[PDB]
Amino acid sequence: MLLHLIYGPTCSGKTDMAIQIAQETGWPVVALDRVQCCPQIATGSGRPLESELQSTRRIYLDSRPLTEGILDAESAHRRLIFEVDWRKSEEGLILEGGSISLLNCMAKSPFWRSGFQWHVKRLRLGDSDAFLTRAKQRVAEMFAIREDRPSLLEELAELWNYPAARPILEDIDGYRCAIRFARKHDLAISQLPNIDAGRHVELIEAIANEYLEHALSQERDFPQWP
After folding, report:
1. How wide is the angle at C-alpha 177 spanned by C-alphas 102 and 203, nearest 5°?
2. Does residue 179 share a domain with residue 189?
3. Are residues 141 and 68 located together in one domain of the fold?
4. Given 72, 101, 124, which residue is the final one in a domain?
5. Is there a single domain that holds both residue 10 and residue 98?
6. Adjacent-strand bridge partners of 28
7. The dihedral sign for the CA sequence 124, 36, 175, 205
8. Cα separation of 160 and 75, whole Å?
9. By residue range, what is the domain housing residue 148?
10. Residue from 50, 33, 42 nearest 95 by CA
11. φ, ψ (nearest 5 deg) of residue 70
């Protein structure tokens, strides 16, 4: 059984790749991503729309209440193992994502060293400049209003009533920014939605940069693959 593995920084179009290979192939893509295991921040954590899914399968290491904490590294890993393991008689899987801690566990761990073949594919952050162009567009998306999906701001809105959420939202990329930036300009999170079109662009531009930095750490902390 084949592990097509795809990883890299935060906006390298990994997902869409996986969706393609998943389409041509009929495989499920497992998501290598702690944060995205919290469907109450679907959008903000970067889960694709169900319509962007193209009828393929995307599998999450688990699914849990923001307030139960972001799934810690180790479990994700044991979880991974299992999700891969009980499918071992299918043809291949895709494994796709950007969790640093998850890939290092892969790298160090004995499970993965045997039993399968690989088709690893690693994307690298290219120029800063063109990353922010991408990131900006991508955030704009997450800010788009829509019948199917809450937006980034709204996930934060709703979720900002329950107080145990707040130190976790402060910890997760994009959200940190959203808070720090309302606390900057003295609005309440609940209001971020109606941020007139001027301050909109900074707040976009801001996240864009928050990601940029992340990208940048993913870069210096990924492992490279055997």
Report:
1. 130
2. yes
3. no
4. 124
5. yes
6. 57
7. positive
8. 27
9. 125-226
10. 33
11. -80, 145
Solved by what technique?
X-ray
* Residue 207 · residue 44 · CB < 8 Å: no
Distance of CA 177 to the CA centre of its chain: 16
Dihedral Cα 39, 210, 215, 193, nearest 10 deg: 40
**Residue 76: count of CB within 10 angstroms of its CB:** 22
Three-state SS letters, the chain = CEEEEEECCCCCCHHHHHHHHHHHHCCEEEECCCHHHCHHHHHHHCCCCCHHHCCCEEEECCCCCHHHCCCCHHHHHHHHHHHHHCCCCCCEEEEEECCHHHHHHHHHCCCCCCCCEEEEEECCCCCHHHHHHHHHHHHHHHHCCCCCCCCHHHHHHHCCCCCCHHHHHCCCCCHHHHHHHHHHCCCCHHHHHHCCHHHHHHHHHHHHHHHHHHHHHHHHHCCCCC
Question: 94 and 67 share a domain?
Answer: yes
How many domains does the chain divide into? 2
For the chain, how many residues are written? Answer: 226
Resolution to one decimal, Å: 2.8
Of the candidates 103, 186, 119, 187, the one whose C-alpha atom is nearest the C-alpha of residue 153 is 187
Judge whether 13 and 215 are in contact, CB under 8 Å. Answer: no
The answer to whether residues 187 and 198 belong to one domain is: yes
CATH number at residue 193: 1.10.287.890
How far apart CA 160 and CA 191 sit, in angstroms, is 12
